[PDB]
């Protein structure tokens, strides 16, 4: 039973539900004056004891970010029980569904998607922002007039600013960087690790660390042994394998920055 604020209903016509989850509801909505379509993300704040709700972080970060490979924030409205975000609607849906539908991608296609993602990451890191939740489900597929596709990064819910090492253990096990799991302190490059895992999935359809018991999974990540198994990876270029390898280094100082990803021949 969402209490939609007057200011939102005044300018937008709320539409159909396009997604639903444990913390947010996302709806299609239409701006009355222009008929332009947008997404309305409704974030349910956590209720505590007494008449109060927990404060949220997403908007503090979203307010700062403006980039073509990032879902644009149009407007925000905070009420005691939930938070309202009007955001650009990306009609092609998200990358999780695309991957299940398409299975795997060509190198020309995957590199273009990685080029997109690393651009977003380079930008965020230039602002000292770590996303900490980069994975296909948080990536949206923009479909161009020319038939081409581009990625847009959304959902800044776990995002924060890096000023010295961070320690909060968070994320999705498949995509989570070893230093996060090691609890020795982490920073911006956890996003590169995530991008590496995504690129790996794009070329073969399965993740590099699949585990067995969530114990085997975490050990695999900490050890970082990246394989490119036959026959799945036989027709994939050495250039692609080299780049993914550099993104998935346990040694944080050796692991590529986003700039280094964009400068690699495979993405150019």
Stretch that binds ligand GUI, among 62-70, 87-95, 206-214, 243-251 (CB under 6 A): 87-95
- Interaction of residue 65 with ligand GUI, rule CB under 6 A: no
Strand boundaries in the chain, DSSP class E: 12-20, 24-31, 37-44, 73-78, 82-88, 129-130, 139-143, 149-153, 160-161
Instruction: Spell out the long-range contacts of 161-166 with Cβ–Cβ below 8 A and sequence spacing 24 or more.
Output: 161/61, 161/128, 161/129, 161/130, 162/128, 162/129, 162/130, 162/187, 162/188, 163/128, 166/130
Nearer Cβ to ligand GUI, position 129 or 240? 129
Q: How many positions of this chain bind ligand GUI (CB under 6 A)?
A: 19
Residue 216: other Cβ atoms inside 10 A: 12
User: 51 is written with which tokens?
Assistant: 């008449």
Query: Shortest distance, CB of residue 26 to ligand GUI, whole angstroms?
Result: 4
Residue 198 and residue 117 in contact, taking contact as beta carbons nearer than 8 Å: yes
Nearest to ligand GUI of 37, 219 (CB atom): 37
Q: Does 87 bind ligand GUI (CB under 6 A)?
A: yes
Q: Is residue 43 a contact residue for ligand GUI (CB under 6 A)?
A: no
**Spatial contact of 152 and 71, defined as CB atoms under 8 Å apart:** yes
Binding residue for ligand GUI, selected from 19, 165, 185, 229, defined by CB under 6 A = 19
Cβ 83 to ligand GUI, closest distance in Å?
12
The answer to whether residue 133 is catalytic is yes
Question: Contact residues for ligand GUI (CB under 6 A)?
Answer: 18-19, 24, 26, 39, 41, 71, 87, 89-91, 93-94, 97, 137-138, 140, 154-155
Annotated binding site: 18-26, 41
Q: Would you list which residues are annotated within the binding site for ATP?
A: 18-26, 41
């Amino acid at each position: 039973g969402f209490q939609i604020p007057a200011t939102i209903t005044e300018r937008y016509k709320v539409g159909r539900t396009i997604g639903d989850g444990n913390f947010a509801v996302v709806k299609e909505c239409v701006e009355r004056s222009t008929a332009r379509e947008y997404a309305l993300k409704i974030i349910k704040k956590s209720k505590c004891r007494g008449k109060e709700h927990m404060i949220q972080n997403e908007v503090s970060i979203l307010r700062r970010v403006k980039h073509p490979n990032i879902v644009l924030l149009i407007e925000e409205m905070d009420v005691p029980t939930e938070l309202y975000l009007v955001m650009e609607l990306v009609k092609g849906g998200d990358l999780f569904d695309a991957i299940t539908s398409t299975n795997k991608y060509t190198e020309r296609d995957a590199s273009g998607m990685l080029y997109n993602l690393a651009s977003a990451i380079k930008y965020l890191h230039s602002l000292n922002i770590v996303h900490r939740d980069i994975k296909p489900e948080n990536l949206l597929v923009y479909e161009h007039q020319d038939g081409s596709k581009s990625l847009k990064l959304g959902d800044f819910g776990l995002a924060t600013i890096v000023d010295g090492p961070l320690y909060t253990v968070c994320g999705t096990p498949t995509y989570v960087a070893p230093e996060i799991i090691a609890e020795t302190g982490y920073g911006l490059k956890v996003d590169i690790w995530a991008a590496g895992v995504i690129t790996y999935i794009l070329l073969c359809g399965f993740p590099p660390f699949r585990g067995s018991d969530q114990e085997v999974l975490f050990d695999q990540i900490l050890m970082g042994q990246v394989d490119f198994p036959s026959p799945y990876w036989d027709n994939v270029s050495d250039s692609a394998k080299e780049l993914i390898t550099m993104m998935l280094l346990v040694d944080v100082d050796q692991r590529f920055s986003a700039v280094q990803v964009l400068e690699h021949p495979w993405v150019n």
